[PDB]
């Protein structure tokens with residue numbers, strides 16, 4: 003039932019805020035936490051993400067963390083910034099300097115217990131807490147280093163709850179900072195061991211979509227983040243709205259993750275169409291379905307045609323006949339059955355929800371668990387070793403007390419993870 | 432928060448600090464008596480310029496700075512100049528007798544008689560900070576005070592503030608304006624003593640600056656006044672990240688991550704464009720493309736060397752003024768192809784780019800034309816080792832005969848300190864050689 007949400011660092015707080023902004027609009031909540039909705043379908047499951055305060059006020063079950071105040075003020079002074087519980091702001095002053103070691107071991111060490119206190123206070127207010135969700139980037143210092151420290155501490159207090167993260171991978175196409183492959187590799191190591199489900203949101207993929215597909219010549223984080231919030235709303239539809247699915251996070255993990263370490267998901271969203279003459283066409287289910295599976299629509303920069311899907315979850319939203327959706331989804335599998343492993347029968351599932359996202363008559367959200375995600379970890383691995391071969395920029399991390407061995411076993415873990423994906427790409431029945 | 436304390440040491444450090452603080456005041460609209468009519472928060476505030484200015488109850492904006500010199504005549508000019516009302520008398524510290532161009536007198540004989548007092552004034556400034564970021568230290572290599580006292584100060588700052596970061600702005604000697612025959616000695620001694628206490632040092636070669644002023648500004652015989660005004664533009668560009676805030680502005684600490692791949696390799700090469708007079712700029716609108724291109728001309732470097740003959744480990748471009756991302760992208764795309772920019776194979780991302788929207792400003796009566804856009808490039812190239820080579824050769828020629836060494840020995844130094852300093856320089860030249868070699 004209840005989910006506790008944590009956003010850490012600049013990126014995590016940025017996309018975390020847009021997420022609450024978007025789903026608040028869907029559930030008919032205004033920026034002061036009052037309900038102004040029509041359908042009651044919007045309150046059926048409102049308690050999943052919102053706490054009910056005195057006076058018919060719904061407040062997000064959200065914890066906001068950062069090692070510097072800047073983004074705290076930014077969120078607090080924005081649209082839907084007043085909706086958040088004021089106790090649930092936990093920030094420092096030092097900042098992490100895009101340094102994983104500062105977030106994970108030195109500066110974050112002091113703030114971490116304050117966060118666990120708010121986490122603990124929210125968990126005890128839950129009827130039956132099902133688990134946690136974290137938004138953060140892997141390329142920085144706070145969301146990457148301190149976000150993973152939070153995951154580790156939270157898992158130790160709630161060892162049987164589901165742990166789920168929306169994790170933004172770094173790309174040289176978007177960001178300037180040379181040490182990002184270092185931060186990401188240390189983070190991936192923590193994620194393979196302490197999360198149950200991780201959505202891989204690749205800034206490299208988000209950039210190609212905005213630049214190539216959407217024709218945005220000067221992409222901003224606001225553009226990228228509006229893709230992320232749309233996808234985050236889509237993948238959480240079946241938690242926040244009733245209908246045909248009696249599903250929570252654990253059931254999703256059980257049916258999406260056939261092997262413990264292989265829990266990194268490839269997300270996608272339809273529709274995506276550049277401005278503007280095509281923005282007025284009516285979307286048909288056949289078109290939604292082809293777009294959803296198109297490699298160029300994927301939100302992790304990896305070619306799904308290079309590998310195989312272990313499992314797929316697809317969710318459609320809006321007014322549409324389920325018969326059309328059924329036929330179309332079966333068409334994709336029957337006509338391209340070599341891209342789905344045959345040792346997992348009937349391994350693509352569909353859910354349809356009546357309420358559509360704001361601004362769209364229809365939409366589809368894609369959750370793919372594909373062996374091709376290895377391309378993402380290979381890319382980060384290449385950048386890592388090019389630098390680590392010569393111990394370049396290592397002093398920023400050893401000056402915080404870290405050893406070289408810790409880097410060696412992080413790259414080691416990621417290389418094995420790559421190997422594991424490769425072995426089911428060639429596994430046959 | 433994130434305050435920065437500036438320390439100006441010796442003649443060059445003091446006179447360059449004067450040029451910088453006048454430029455800062457013009458940029459922020461601070462008047463020579465410290466009033467800032469633009470500032471609404473009186474008594475304090477957490478604004479961006481507050482990293483460099485504290486405020487008094489009466490509305491005075493006071494440089495977070497210390498000027499120190501072993502004799503008085505230079506700082507005396509500050510005490511009586513246009514901005515005399517800007518500083519509290521205790522921020523200006525002078526002795527009675529200078530180092531006589533002798534590192535040993537600056538580090539020991541004279542320096543030891545004023546060091547405690549200087550560290551005290553600094554503590555008083557640090558105590559006014561809520562989140563002290565670190566220190567900026569301005570000094571010459573060649574002066575007795577710029578070399579010897581600056582070394583003592585830096586060693587003391589490590590002891591009193593631990594790992595707190597210290598950045599240097601150093602004047603590298605040039606015969607066209609050099610005041611002493613022994614400046615290579617003082618240069619190697621201070622560089623040896625300071626290497627492990629400095630996080631990042633920006634070297635300015637007086638000959639490079641001298642030539643730029645002659646060629647680009649049309650000044651037949653440049654003075655310190657010409658040199659410092661140009662230097663201050665470079666300093667303003669580097670600190671502009673801290674004093675202003677913009678959506679595309681990127682902080683100097685993020686540049687430092689990219690610029691320093693190993694502790695000892697912390698000497699970025701600076702360039703600045705456009706450097707042009709009012710006469711020539713009257714009929715010449717310089718585009719992002721033109722000023723970006725100028726950053727890669729060997730003759731525009733702030734230290735004489737040839738980066739074509741070296742390898743880059745980082746390029747940071749600090750744009751300011753009328754600049755939009757689209758123009759920068761095209762400019763760099765052009766440079767990548769028309770140029771031979773070679774990066775080491777261990778640096779995946781070589782370029783880092785930010786825009787500060789605050790337009791460049793100039794002091795009235797200066798020699799620089801007022802332009803709409805400017806760019807400062809900080810790069811880390813192995814070519815900067817050429818400057819170490821040239822210094823070390825002048826050292827070796829004199830030291831082989833022990834010329835002038837009796838002046839340092841007479842003050843308490845040992846010869847071992849000389850050869851120790853020189854051997855450290857030898858390792859530095861080698862370090863620049865090994866980072867440039869391709870990976871196995």
Ligand SMILES: CC[C@]1(O)C[C@@H]2CN(CCc3c([nH]c4ccccc34)[C@@](C(=O)OC)(c3cc4c(cc3OC)N(C)[C@H]3[C@@](O)(C(=O)OC)[C@H](OC(C)=O)[C@]5(CC)C=CCN6CC[C@]43[C@@H]65)C2)C1
Nearest residue numbers: 175176177219220221222223756757759760763764782784
């Ligand atoms: C989505 C957030 C983003 O806005 C995405 C880009 C980068 N930054 C901020 C804004 C920005 C951009 N360009 C700037 C130039 C100066 C100052 C700021 C910018 C941005 C753009 O043009 O649209 C707004 C951009 C940036 C780049 C960018 C594209 C881009 O917008 C299209 N490139 C993908 C890289 C880049 O390195 C590259 O690989 O070539 C294409 C690219 O190189 C060249 C020659 O263009 C370039 C351009 C300055 C060069 C060096 C540093 N790298 C980092 C990323 C890259 C850039 C957009 C963050």
Ligand SMILES: CC[C@@H](/C=C(/C)[C@@H]1C[C@@H](OC)C[C@H](O)C(C)(C)[C@@]2(O)O[C@@H](C[C@H](OC)[C@@H](O)C(=O)O1)C[C@@H](OC)[C@@H]2O)CO
Nearest residue numbers: 291292293294295296297298299306307334337338341342
């Ligand atoms: C589905 C498995 C795995 C790859 C396959 C085989 C998928 C199959 C179907 O996916 C929608 C494609 C579909 O049948 C079509 C051919 C009608 C179609 O939509 O193809 C895309 C081109 C796409 O480029 C990426 C293609 O290469 C691709 O992705 O193919 C536009 C256009 O091309 C002519 C055409 O309208 C992706 O999950």
Ligand SMILES: C/C(=C\c1csc(C)n1)[C@H]1C[C@H]2O[C@H]2CCC[C@@H](C)[C@H](O)[C@@H](C)C(=O)C(C)(C)[C@@H](O)CC(=O)O1
Nearest residue numbers: 216218225228229232273274275276277280281282283
């Ligand atoms: C493609 C879209 C709609 C659409 C497709 S066909 C039709 C009738 N409508 C949606 C997609 C939404 O998931 C959201 C992400 C889109 C990002 C945009 C905000 C983008 O930044 C911007 C440049 C746009 O593309 C438009 C503002 C033109 C947007 O309305 C169209 C779009 O992509 O939104």
Ligand SMILES: Nc1nc2c(ncn2[C@@H]2O[C@H](COP(=O)(O)OP(=O)(O)OP(=O)(O)O)[C@@H](O)[C@H]2O)c(=O)[nH]1
Nearest residue numbers: 441442443446529530531532571574575576577608
């Ligand atoms: N760019 C620049 N260089 C200067 C300036 N003043 C002195 N120098 C250079 O600095 C060196 C001399 O060191 P100074 O700073 O004058 O000496 P000091 O630190 O006062 O040392 P002592 O007087 O010996 O105690 C020479 O190379 C000069 O060319 C100045 O205002 N600008």
Ligand SMILES: Nc1nc2c(ncn2[C@@H]2O[C@H](COP(=O)(O)OP(=O)(O)O)[C@@H](O)[C@H]2O)c(=O)[nH]1
Nearest residue numbers: 011012013016139141142143144145172177223
């Ligand atoms: N998609 C997206 N990525 C972001 C955003 N802000 C920062 N990033 C990315 O996050 C990384 C830097 O981490 P950041 O969140 O800034 O650092 P932190 O505050 O230390 O966690 C880089 O790869 C950035 O490109 C954002 O709003 N959206």
Ligand SMILES: [Ca+2]
Nearest residue numbers: 472473475476
């Ligand atoms: Ca103020």
Ligand SMILES: [Mg+2]
Nearest residue numbers: 012013100142
């Ligand atoms: Mg950041």
Ligand SMILES: [Mg+2]
Nearest residue numbers: 441442529576
């Ligand atoms: Mg002097």
